Design a protein around this ligand. Structure first.
Ligand SMILES: CCCCCCCCCCCCCCCCCC(=O)OC[C@H](COP(=O)(O)OCCN)OC(=O)CCCCCCCCCCCCCCCCC
Ligand code: SF4
Ligand SMILES: [Ca+2]
Lengths: 191, 148, 216, 50, 410
């Protein structure tokens, strides 16, 4: 499957030269780095091409990398039940950059893009129903960004005065403890 | 005497006919369900489920209460006729549990509704919940009046 | 783009389920094109469930916030409404379909001029755009039955709440750090009494900050 | 009896219509579904996809 | 694919249908609703009880698991997996262990591999018993859940005897399984397997050929192969339509190659087919459990954890040997480091393909942990699936999709 995945990666790199930035095969998985402007065209090719028939969209997610000029990665996981193979597609996205929506290709991409928008704040263009899907109504912020606190900023309580569940600033009886165990020794890479 | 024995009869009827709202939030609801299944048969105590809050005397908060869910739990509690009792089941409902430090979780359901009994565990076993329900019955016998 | 489907979806999934029952508000939001009232660069994201940035420190509020804000003002066919910080005029256009007339106050001459052009292009005629500082309102046409402030405040100046009729309603989003509270005010015996309405967030409007100096 | 028949004919003539855009089931065909024919076990060899 | 404007076979157009739809029959179906699993707020638009729009509002059980995982070590994150598809917790633990084992290049002992297959199939029965019999309760059958959950009670006792917890085992570990099974537990699992087919027959006698049951499921929620590919269907959601796809065979993991079992598939792809598939899968899992117990008895005594640099030593060694005490101290505080890389490890979970997308960066904590729940993709399709059906069919459709919201919301 390692030779098979390398052969498949050449087929994609050849047929979609301008979409593909590079390919990698690590830990038995093929990853394709693609340009933002060509990701929809490439995923469409992967879905429909005979050699690579990736007709199941497994999921879409994002990864935050604040140290990088384009801080976000958007990652597409696709499965082919007919060819019995998997592929990962990665695109680098800058903050406030728009990502084209995949709902034209996969109707089931709709909720995954809402989740990326909710938890990372990445907007998708061409999305019919783009609204928060997992956080509370009117939530401020995007919790899966590395610079959002784990406990957030606000918490709810039932107020006897307002007879409502209201938000208040977070007050922790015991503050979150973040132990740092990491050793100053990397170890060796023996040949 | 008349009034204490009257309360005893009221507490006897309320303990023997304790109907709970069909309301399960998470994996504490799995063990709550096992409590009503043949091995334990919660209903043999007269403690039967009711779909509507208008017919419920007992709310078992069985699972994590998120911020988004908190208004809905308060609403159905508010629509329980009185007397109404609340059991907090499991770590999440008791104090937030494994998600205590999350941005989207209520750190204990007693921030939303008053609680009568706390059942510890993650989840409490079906038997532990049954014990907690009987501790609520002791509490009502000890302190129950016509008001509650 | 089929903006009509996006508009209907926005009302169905972002307005109706959020305790917006006033059918005049639902009718208005189903008809006023949101994309016509955003900068051209934001046109494709006009119906997203978030605040749209109009200018530095200024936003077009999220559909849930505006829907709930208008639903609790409870506007009448005979009402005169002051819309503070109208931006490109989306909110004024929606309220114009319910109230008798709207005085839209904008402080950026660029947005005030665009509001007039876009309001006219949608054939909205009971909306007058008045250019000036937001914190001043428009006292020339006062008193108003309702005042809507379209951005976060820390305090509402007395000059602004004096332009409110007795029995008038004012709705403002208050900011306390990371917490935003929409409050509904009622003018009684000359005093505006504020009450909690719901929680929502927006950036602070310029001119509505509070006086904050050294504290030991 | 004929007065009642006229009412039967009239009501159906005047009002009868059926939505053609909803999902409908034939009850007798639902009851004829044979579990032996509708589900079967497959010997899928290791590594084999569709 | 839009039926809100009614279409009649006589072509008639009502005056009211001409007006724009402002006053629609919208109803909150859940969260506090017996068929809504407690945390589903589905907004339904009804027209004479015909479902014309279904708008699931989820996140009422979103707890920020993926955020909480980023500040914990790999071992501290293992119990979070238990609480996603919490009906069958060890099956979800398996994806986390497989991902770590792949990135670290670790080989788990043979006995641990057999135990993982054994308790994974227990989880499949635990899930299918819950799914099938509460699905029956959704169409009004009161009794099936009582019979099924007695059998679940017995399986939860097998959970407790392996790890000390009835539900949230935390039993599968990176490097194998925490503890070995007592010999008397293997005898009891074998004894339970001999009885279990009788319960499956009894449930089949009560339901399968009942005319009411057939009229509530046959030709309801029909899924074609093309629909399956629109919505990311996996598991029984594709097998019910006749696609013999099962990750244990197509992309084998653990030691499933050497077990004998078959893949049930449906021909019509409706709620009735998926019910029959789940009943058949329960029989197949029972057979696997029987083979695994036989293999475990025939195995030579061995360890259940890989030890080495990945798992703590045994307690007796920890209290005697200096190296073991250090490895115990370090692995319970810092934990192993996972080399930089990204993997997606998937299993055939009872509800479909469950996967973990793990981004490691060489430290002792995950950089990113994305959890792929099969129910997230299945629930998203309820609007398409329920359009055109009646309100009474909605609980059956929610059942057939096999939704648990611990994994939908995470
Ligand atoms: C056939 C017709 C049936 C008619 C309906 C019967 C139900 C009505 C009577 C209620 C049942 C008795 C009851 O309420 O028991 C209370 C009391 C228990 O006493 P004890 O447990 O010692 O005190 C606990 C204090 N927390 O009770 C006792 O100890 C029993 C004393 C007799 C009470 C009879 C009712 C007057
Ligand atoms: S306390 Fe434990 S078992 Fe109960 S809902 Fe929370 S995580 Fe699940
Ligand atoms: Ca209709």
């Amino acid at each position: 499957s390692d030779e098979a995945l390398l052969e498949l990666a050449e087929h994609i790199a050849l047929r979609r030269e301008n979409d593909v930035i590079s390919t990698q095969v690590a830990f038995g998985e093929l990853t394709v780095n693609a340009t933002l402007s060509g990701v929809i065209g490439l995923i469409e090719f992967l879905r429909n091409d005979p050699n690579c028939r990736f007709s199941t969209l497994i999921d879409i997610t994002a990864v935050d990398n604040p140290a990088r000029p384009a801080r976000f990665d958007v990652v597409y996981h696709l499965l082919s039940m007919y060819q019995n193979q998997r592929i990962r597609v990665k695109v680098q996205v800058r903050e406030d950059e728009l990502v084209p929506s995949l709902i034209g290709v996969f109707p089931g991409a709709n909720w995954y893009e809402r989740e990326v928008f909710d938890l990372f704040g990445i907007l998708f263009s061409g999305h019919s129903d783009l609204r928060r899907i997992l956080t509370d109504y009117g939530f401020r912020g995007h919790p899966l960004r590395k610079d959002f606190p784990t406990t957030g900023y606000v918490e709810v309580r039932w107020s006897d005065i307002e007879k409502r569940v209201v938000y208040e600033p977070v007050n922790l009886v015991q503050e979150y403890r973040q132990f740092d165990f990491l050793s100053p020794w990397e170890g060796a890479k023996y040949v | 005497f008349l009034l204490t024995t009257t309360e005893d009869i009221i507490n006897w009827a309320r303990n023997g006919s304790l109907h709970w709202m069909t309301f399960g939030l998470a994996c504490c609801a799995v063990e709550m369900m096992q409590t009503s299944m043949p091995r334990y048969d919660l209903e043999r105590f007269g403690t039967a489920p009711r779909a509507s809050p208008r017919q419920s005397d007992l709310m078992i908060v069985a699972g994590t209460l998120t911020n988004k869910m908190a208004p809905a739990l308060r609403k159905v509690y508010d629509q329980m006729p009185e007397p109404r009792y609340v059991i907090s089941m499991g770590s999440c409902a008791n104090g937030g549990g494994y998600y205590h430090y999350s941005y989207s979780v209520v750190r204990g359901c007693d921030r939303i509704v008053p609680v009568d009994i706390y059942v510890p565990g993650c989840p409490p076993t079906a038997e532990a919940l049954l014990y907690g329900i009987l501790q609520l019955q002791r509490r009502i016998r000890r302190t129950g009046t016509l008001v509650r | 783009t089929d903006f009509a489907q996006r508009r209907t979806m926005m009302v169905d999934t972002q307005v109706r389920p959020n305790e917006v029952t006033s059918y005049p508000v639902i009718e208005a939001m189903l008809n006023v094109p949101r994309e016509q009232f955003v900068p051209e660069s934001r046109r494709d994201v006009a119906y997203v469930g978030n605040n749209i940035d109009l200018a530095p420190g200024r936003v077009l509020l999220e559909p849930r916030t505006l829907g709930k804000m208008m639903d609790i003002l409870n506007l009448q066919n005979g009402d005169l409404v002051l819309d503070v910080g109208c931006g490109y005029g989306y909110s004024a256009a929606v309220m114009a379909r319910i109230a008798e007339a709207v005085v839209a106050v904008e402080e950026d001459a660029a947005m005030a001029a665009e509001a007039e052009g876009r309001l006219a292009a949608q054939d909205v005629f009971n909306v007058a755009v008045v250019q000036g500082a937001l914190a001043e309102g428009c006292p020339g046409q006062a008193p108003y039955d309702a005042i809507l402030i379209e951005g976060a405040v820390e305090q509402v100046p007395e000059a602004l709440t004096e332009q409110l009729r007795e029995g008038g309603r004012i709705v403002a989003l208050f900011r306390e750090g990371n917490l935003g509270i929409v409050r509904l005010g009622h003018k009684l015996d000359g005093r505006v009494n504020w009450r909690f309405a719901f929680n929502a967030v927006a950036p602070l409007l310029p001119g509505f900050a509070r006086p904050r100096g050294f504290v030991l | 009896g004929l007065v009642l028949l006229v009412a039967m004919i009239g009501a159906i003539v005047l009002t009868m219509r059926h939505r053609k855009d909803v999902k409908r089931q034939n009850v007798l065909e639902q009851m004829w579904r044979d579990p032996a024919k509708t589900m079967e076990l497959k010997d899928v060899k290791p590594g084999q996809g569709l | 694919g839009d039926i809100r404007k009614n279409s009649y076979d006589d072509g008639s157009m009502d005056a009211l249908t001409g007006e724009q739809s402002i006053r629609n029959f919208n109803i909150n179906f859940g969260p506090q609703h017996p068929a809504a699993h407690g945390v589903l707020r589905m907004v339904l638009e009804l027209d004479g009880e015909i479902v014309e729009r279904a708008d699931p509002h989820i996140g009422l059980l979103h707890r920020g698991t993926e955020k909480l995982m980023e500040s914990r070590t790999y071992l501290q994150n293992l119990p979070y997996l238990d609480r996603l598809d919490y009906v069958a917790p060890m099956n979800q633990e398996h994806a986390w262990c497989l991902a770590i084992e792949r990135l670290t290049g670790t080989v788990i002992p043979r006995r641990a591999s057999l135990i993982r297959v054994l308790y994974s199939e227990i989880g499949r029965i635990l899930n299918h018993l819950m799914g099938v019999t509460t699905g029956a309760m959704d169409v009004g059958a009161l009794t099936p859940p009582l019979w099924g959950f007695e059998a679940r009670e017995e399986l939860m006792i097998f959970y407790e005897r392996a790890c000390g917890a009835r539900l949230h085992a935390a039993y599968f570990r990176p490097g194998g399984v925490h503890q070995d099974l007592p010999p008397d537990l293997l005898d009891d699992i074998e004894e339970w397997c001999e009885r279990f087919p009788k319960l499956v027959d009894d449930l089949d006698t009560l339901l399968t050929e009942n005319r009411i049951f057939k009229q509530r499921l046959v030709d309801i929620g029909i899924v074609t192969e093309a629909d399956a590919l629109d919505w990311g269907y996996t598991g029984v959601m594709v097998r019910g339509s006749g696609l013999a796809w099962d990750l244990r065979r197509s992309q084998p993991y653990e030691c499933y190659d050497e077990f004998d079992f078959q893949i049930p598939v449906g021909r019509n792809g409706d709620c009735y087919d998926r019910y029959l598939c789940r009943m058949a899968e329960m029989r197949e899992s029972c057979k696997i459990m029987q083979q695994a117990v036989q293999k475990l008895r025939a195995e030579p005594a061995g360890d259940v954890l890989a030890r080495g640099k990945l798992t703590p030593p045994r307690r007796a060694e920890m209290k005697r040997d200096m190296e073991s005490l250090i490895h115990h101290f370090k692995l319970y505080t810092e934990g192993f480091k996972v080399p930089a890389g990204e993997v997606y490890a998937a299993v055939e979970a009872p509800k479909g393909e469950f996967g973990v997308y793990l981004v490691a960066d060489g430290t002792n904590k995950p950089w990113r942990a994305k959890l792929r729940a099969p129910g997230f993709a299945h629930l998203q399709s309820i609007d398409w699936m329920s359009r055109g059906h009646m309100l009474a069919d909605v609980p059956a459709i929610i059942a057939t999709l096999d939704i648990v919201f611990g994994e939908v919301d995470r």
